[PDB]
Amino acid sequence: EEDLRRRLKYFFMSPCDKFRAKGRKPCKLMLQVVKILVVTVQLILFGLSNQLVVTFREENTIAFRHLFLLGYSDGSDDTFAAYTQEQLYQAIFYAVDQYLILPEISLGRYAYVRALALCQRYYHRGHVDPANDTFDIDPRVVTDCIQVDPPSASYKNLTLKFHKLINVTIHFQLKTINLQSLINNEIPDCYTFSILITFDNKAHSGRIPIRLETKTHIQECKSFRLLFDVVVILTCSLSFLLCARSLLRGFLLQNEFVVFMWRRRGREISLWERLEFVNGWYILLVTSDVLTISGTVMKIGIEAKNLASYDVCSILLGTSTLLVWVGVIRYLTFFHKYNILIATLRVALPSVMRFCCCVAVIYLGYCFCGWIVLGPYHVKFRSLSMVSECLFSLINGDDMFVTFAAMQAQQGHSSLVWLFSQLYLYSFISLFIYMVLSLFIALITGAYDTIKHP
Amino acid sequence: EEDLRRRLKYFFMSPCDKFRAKGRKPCKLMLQVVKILVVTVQLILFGLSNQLVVTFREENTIAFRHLFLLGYSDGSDDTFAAYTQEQLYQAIFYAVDQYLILPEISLGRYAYVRALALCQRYYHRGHVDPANDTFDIDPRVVTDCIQVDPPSASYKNLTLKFHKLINVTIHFQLKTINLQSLINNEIPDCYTFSILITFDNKAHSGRIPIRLETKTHIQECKSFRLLFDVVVILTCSLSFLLCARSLLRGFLLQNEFVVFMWRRRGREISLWERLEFVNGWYILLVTSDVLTISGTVMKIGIEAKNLASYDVCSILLGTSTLLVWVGVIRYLTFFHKYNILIATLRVALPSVMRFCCCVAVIYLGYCFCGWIVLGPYHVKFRSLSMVSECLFSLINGDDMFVTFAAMQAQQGHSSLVWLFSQLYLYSFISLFIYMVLSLFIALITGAYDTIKHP
Amino acid sequence: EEDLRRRLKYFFMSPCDKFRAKGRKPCKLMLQVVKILVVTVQLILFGLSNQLVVTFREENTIAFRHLFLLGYSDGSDDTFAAYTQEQLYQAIFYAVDQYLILPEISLGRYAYVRALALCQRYYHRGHVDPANDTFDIDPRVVTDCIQVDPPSASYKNLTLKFHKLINVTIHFQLKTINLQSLINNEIPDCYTFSILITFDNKAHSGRIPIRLETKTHIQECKSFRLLFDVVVILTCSLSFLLCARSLLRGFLLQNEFVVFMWRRRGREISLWERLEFVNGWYILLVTSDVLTISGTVMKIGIEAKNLASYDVCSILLGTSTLLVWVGVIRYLTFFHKYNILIATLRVALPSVMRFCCCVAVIYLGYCFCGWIVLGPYHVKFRSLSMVSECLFSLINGDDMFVTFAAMQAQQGHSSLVWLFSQLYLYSFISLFIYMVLSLFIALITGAYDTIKHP
Amino acid sequence: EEDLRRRLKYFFMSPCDKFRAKGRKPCKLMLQVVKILVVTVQLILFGLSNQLVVTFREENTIAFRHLFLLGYSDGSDDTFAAYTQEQLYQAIFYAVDQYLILPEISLGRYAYVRALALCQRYYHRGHVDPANDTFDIDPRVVTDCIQVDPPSASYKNLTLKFHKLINVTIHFQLKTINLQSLINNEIPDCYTFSILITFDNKAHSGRIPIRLETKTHIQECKSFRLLFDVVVILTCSLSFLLCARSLLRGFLLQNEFVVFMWRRRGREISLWERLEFVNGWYILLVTSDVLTISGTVMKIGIEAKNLASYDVCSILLGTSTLLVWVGVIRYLTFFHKYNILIATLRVALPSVMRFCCCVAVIYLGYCFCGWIVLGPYHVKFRSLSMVSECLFSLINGDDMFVTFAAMQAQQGHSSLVWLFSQLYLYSFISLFIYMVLSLFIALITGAYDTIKHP
Numbered sequence A, B, C, D: 001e002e003d004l005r006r007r008l009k010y011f012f013m014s015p016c017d018k019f020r021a022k023g024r025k026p027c028k029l030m031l032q033v034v035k036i037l038v039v040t041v042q043l044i045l046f047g048l049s050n051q052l053v054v055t056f057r058e059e060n061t062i063a064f065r066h067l068f069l070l071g072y073s074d075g076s077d078d079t080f081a082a083y084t085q086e087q088l089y090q091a092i093f094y095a096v097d098q099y100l101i102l103p104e105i106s107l108g109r110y111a112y113v114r115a116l117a118l119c120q121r122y123y124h125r126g127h128v129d130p131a132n133d134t135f136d137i138d139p140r141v142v143t144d145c146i147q148v149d150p151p152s153a154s155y156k157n158l159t160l161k162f163h164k165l166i167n168v169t170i171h172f173q174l175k176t177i178n179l180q181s182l183i184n185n186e187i188p189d190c191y192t193f194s195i196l197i198t199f200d201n202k203a204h205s206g207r208i209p210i211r212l213e214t215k216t217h218i219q220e221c222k223s224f225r226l227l228f229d230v231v232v233i234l235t236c237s238l239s240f241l242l243c244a245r246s247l248l249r250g251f252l253l254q255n256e257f258v259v260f261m262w263r264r265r266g267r268e269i270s271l272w273e274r275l276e277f278v279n280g281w282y283i284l285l286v287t288s289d290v291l292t293i294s295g296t297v298m299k300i301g302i303e304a305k306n307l308a309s310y311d312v313c314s315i316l317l318g319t320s321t322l323l324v325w326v327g328v329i330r331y332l333t334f335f336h337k338y339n340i341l342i343a344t345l346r347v348a349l350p351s352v353m354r355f356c357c358c359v360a361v362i363y364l365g366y367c368f369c370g371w372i373v374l375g376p377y378h379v380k381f382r383s384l385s386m387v388s389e390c391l392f393s394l395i396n397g398d399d400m401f402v403t404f405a406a407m408q409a410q411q412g413h414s415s416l417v418w419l420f421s422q423l424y425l426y427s428f429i430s431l432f433i434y435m436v437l438s439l440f441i442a443l444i445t446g447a448y449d450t451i452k453h454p
């Protein structure tokens, strides 16, 4: 078949060779430049909206913490607590008293929403007695709510139950108007902050942490976006059909190649020669194509009705734009100078992934060994996730002297954990910097030397 | 002997070759997968207990420091001291006054244990007189204890002896009940905190540091563990007998090989050919086997009676689990692609250990040179351990600009230590990053090239 | 042409060969040593002036912040704000009251300049009402200035408009005399500080930041420089004519080489053989020559009349001195041992720049992916510039554990961004340290091996 | 000459070959093991004395800062200053009032030494007038001392001259007794602290920094060392004569080799063959030998009379011990496996030192370019030393994100320095990590490959 050879001349032909031979063929290549530009501009333009929204969220939450938390200096979100009995009464009474006089205090136009509800939660049959070691506990949790309305004995005389206490929560809402939007020449977005001050007594340890949490329900008051957002799906869908048409030809031209080796007696050639016939780049491009058109329909559903679930939308558009940019490495491999550079990973990957298991095992071994031993006597090694972040930080070198000095300052309780800590940390750091990183260098150099000489 | 050749065909045979030839042989290999799973699950399940115990320890100790230490802001454990005469009286009197009214203050159910005992320790014949330089010192240390019982002149009128003073210690106990255990659906663990507030006057320098230390005596109040903890020793002992049986065959089949070369006149072959006959992996597996069965019997002795010595138990189980995971590199070397990767250290180790001595000497030389010279004029170089941690941190690069700026900010006392500090630090950092790390890279690359071509 | 061959013997001849053959030829080489010394001494002598000027600027600005800002502890320039209504009145009234009694307070000789003007700016028709969601806004900004003269009702009774407020600015000037100049034995420089205290209400979020800014107008009161500053331009201009004369010979001797290959039928030789004939070092030297003579005329215009625009002057002299020092690598390549070392980049540059695009794309991909996703739930990833600085810091390893712990401490809002953060950060750090840095090492080693064997 | 060949057989013979041939020759080698042990034990034993001395110095200096400085919280040595007029009067009056009542306040036995002298220094003819710009200055500095004797108008009514003020210094002495020495079972060391509180008004900027400095005059009150300190000089002198005897033989056996090539007509062989005949290790050993015997005589002169100049003594003993440890690399090169490892630097050094100049030039170029440009607008780049420490810290990677964020937070004054800062820092970091470190790796690998194959 002299035509099918001429097809395979044209199937493996680069478009540069095809342009200098045929001409008038940008029909595939113009899309994959437009699609890069259209997706990334859509990403940046959407990414500048969340700067204004999140900074107007964060500044209002800080301005709530100075108004409703007693004695709050900044940079102390974690080590802020109430320890005696009177500090908890003062922290509650200050919050409600700073709520009731809010227009004569604050600096924004914080209106009210019809309001405040105080509630404590205590065990039903609580009986704790360390002198006699007697317990008789019903674990049913009963609440005791107090209603407070804004414009003392309706609110005061609130006696807590410190011998059985779980949470004391304060819940109220505030409504305000973004005034920056008129400077940005648009229709405003009236927000609704939902504040939940939490006094936690979960561990029953006499250390009650205090924290404040907000939540916004964005809504309009009493088109460069939507025209562009149908362009980003029209381009991407047109590429989704045009690329799938090419893989459809790839499967069918593969299929009449499998036909010949039953007539030429090619002994039913296995997975190797048929992997050298289907492009792999269109796989990455089509799995970019699904994610962009999913995320933009999601974004239409965001701005229309539900201004909350930015999570799935952002995690799809960012991963789509990540996969589209790597699809420009497609263009570079048509040159005979880049073609050495891109072919350095196709031979190393079935060896460097073989070595990555041998590193991941030993790394996981030092994770389990370090976490149980240096769990109690150290602060960087509490949970297994935090051990994994600490040991992976120490490899490139982030925080060595802090991990050493935190061990030396207390020396554990006895000298056996300190003498173990010296051998543990020195052997682990000396292993992965010298003998393991070096092995990785040797593998990539040998894989490059395999590509260079032929 | 045609049978002994057929034994050596079967002795060096991989189990993959043995399964594809014989079949029905998982009898060795099923243990070393079960033993990985059983040990590590036992480790994680024991490792989650100490999270609840240690966090209930640490939160109660912080809640003691806010209640009994005068003017304690957090993050100031080391630079907390008493300097004048009245600050020490106020720091003692505040601690006892905050002890006597403890139920009307604290937030836990801290009961008392029959109580408080104040005691100061002073030299018998103390005579310090810098005007006349006269000393007449009996170094016998006499205590002066005060008994305080909880429900002023029994406690007040406590005049210290500031011209001869060693320690002022306050000792008392508190008993409480963990209430988190009922949420975790079990029998509680009544703790007993033992508090020792220490006012140290050891160096006699007018800087008395203040610190608080606790100690717990865990005891029950007035079975997924123990069934699993006999599985972890039954599996490991069965592997301890089954592996030792294999090394017993290895020594005996070695022994009748030594017999032949006295009849074949093999001239009493030395240590090389007989090292190529005994496996080394069973050595690591059997020294895992001793440590697991020692640590779990230790853990039974922990939870039954003595809830204190977690040190030896944790340092054995963690090291055992460390050696079991590295024993999965055993499995990878049966493939002819991993067999290049694992053979990169067998030839480098009698050369990279030859180079590790040449690095450890020069490193130790900069330790002794830096510690005496930059001892006084610098804060990172106090003890020799702290010099070793600082110089080893600077190699990968942790804290360079802090070590430079601490030198520049004072410039020592004169410019000779600063001009020495610049030459010391620049020559040391430039030595081990460029010329020494590079040598390590060259050694591993040459060792890989020795394995690759044959 | 036997003479033109003898010219090309002399044109490519090194001056070391030319000195050992001819002698009495330093006429080119003495300039390029003098020009290094003259430029760098001019740089250091100018660079020591700005130490005295800027430290006398910074110390006076700190001394203004302690005098005019209410409750200012150092290291808190960013988290200094006013949150309630009364804190803003106290922060304004404290600043003007500390202005009027300034000679009986301060420690310098701060005189007055005829003075203080307070001004607030508010919207004309401001109507914000979150209860009814009604707005009727004229965005014209009207000021309301108050005049205050130094030696209460002229200044007091200043009622702000908190429901429509943009800026409250305080502007005044202070004149002082540098007394360090008499110790430095010269004519003094009377400064004029121009202070602008700013109360910003741009975002309308109830968080008003406070900051103080100064500006100096240096002027003399009521010659080693200028003699040296004409030497630095006389030397550099003489090199500017002497080097351009050599490139003029280079173009003309190239031109009569292009003539021959039309008579010898050399087929109009392209860009390669004619690039091996023009020196590239004189290009760097002449673009040093333009920048030095531009910056020093600029510096004359600075010290004569306009003591403000140090920006263009410094950015030209520093870049000129940067290009002059690299012009000493010119001297080293005449030796046959350095000639291997300098020839390691001429062959790698059309391959390592080919690889730098393949790294810059993937790096830019992780920038766009990380910024939108971890924008809201993280503080290091606010703007795209700050993402680029954070991801480039993590490659060599700067701040890994802070970026991990800031993610773990809040876990976002839900676990999907945390589970995305672990995969994002681990894949990105493992990519550029192991597989990409290693590729760079392999390229430079192969480029050196290309130069070494021939 | 068959004997001189037999000498050269014995001259280049290793002692291992000489022991297995001759025997009873430890006469050279026993010294160089004893000398390592004797010097380092002398170093450690002297190095443990300065821990007790310097910590008794530092704790007393901190205890002075809490007693004599008004409002001193720790960690604030640099940002502690007095800004108004009344803060300087209160800082002086608090220091003298806390001096006069010192036994009823402090916790040590601080006696007095006959005492306190207050003194201020002001210009004689001071005339500063920014309204009229008139100056008439006599730079002669006149002091005004006040005498204060310990057991108000003798001390009060101290009117400063704020319009001409240089320093206000307070000087007094305190004597105490180290009581730790009786616990260490010895004769005590009565110290004499010399305190100099300094109020600096050098820059005349209205920011007066405050700092306290002490100085000790150690003296005894009203032998494992000295026996060992003559051993360390007896051993080292005996090696100083025994090694110089060997180099004396080396010069003389070289001399009768130069004789032969005038009779054999060897054409007066140059520096190469005569460098392959003199050992280089005895040069390092003899320059260790001078420094040890100098430093220990210095140490005798320290402990006898002058307990001050620890500078020259420590900087000689530390450098001597540095050179003695590297002299154990001498021993390793006798083995034919280490002999490849030690020979990796003899061929690289006349090439890696050729490359170190090409790096030091470009590094110095970025130092001069960065210091003038980013001098004013940045805090890490003030002096040229601090630029060199900052740029050298950024290469291995220490403090990248702090240097980037300090630039971004202010953006200079205008955007031109910020746009210059991005290009400066990115080009410099990308240059030395990728292209320059990689070049270093290639040089050491090629130098190892030159040694490996022959």
Ligand SMILES: *[C@@H]1O[C@H](CO)[C@@H](O[C@@H]2O[C@H](CO)[C@@H](O)[C@H](O)[C@H]2NC(C)=O)[C@H](O)[C@H]1NC(C)=O
Pocket: A121, A141, A166, A167, A169, A196, A198
């Ligand atoms: C305070 O404690 C109560 C429990 O006593 C919490 O109520 C639980 O809330 C979670 C939702 O996060 C539910 O799944 C549980 O079923 C609730 N338990 C009960 C008994 O209601 C309450 O959420 C806590 N407060 C805060 C702010 O977390």
Ligand SMILES: *[C@@H]1O[C@H](CO)[C@@H](O[C@@H]2O[C@H](CO)[C@@H](O)[C@H](O)[C@H]2NC(C)=O)[C@H](O)[C@H]1NC(C)=O
Pocket: B121, B141, B166, B167, B169, B196, B198
């Ligand atoms: C306070 O100082 C006394 C000594 O004056 C300490 O008592 C010593 O304690 C250790 C145990 O750690 C014993 O080995 C010594 O023999 C004890 N000496 C005497 C004289 O009793 C006491 O422990 C110190 N206080 C604290 C809390 O450490």
Ligand SMILES: *[C@@H]1O[C@H](CO)[C@@H](O[C@@H]2O[C@H](CO)[C@@H](O)[C@H](O)[C@H]2NC(C)=O)[C@H](O)[C@H]1NC(C)=O
Pocket: C121, C141, C166, C167, C169, C196, C198
């Ligand atoms: C306070 O806000 C006003 C605007 O209400 C600022 O005035 C603007 O200043 C910039 C110059 O930086 C001009 O380009 C604008 O046209 C000005 N707008 C108006 C309405 O005048 C003022 O600069 C702000 N104060 C400070 C200190 O920045």
Ligand SMILES: *[C@@H]1O[C@H](CO)[C@@H](O[C@@H]2O[C@H](CO)[C@@H](O)[C@H](O)[C@H]2NC(C)=O)[C@H](O)[C@H]1NC(C)=O
Pocket: D121, D141, D166, D167, D169, D196, D198
């Ligand atoms: C306070 O300032 C005076 C100068 O007014 C300093 O006196 C100088 O001290 C140095 C020694 O360090 C001498 O070289 C100078 O000659 C002295 N000058 C005069 C005029 O006496 C004094 O040292 C400063 N105080 C401190 C603590 O440094």
Ligand code: NA
Pocket: A398, B398, C398, D398
């Ligand atoms: Na750091």
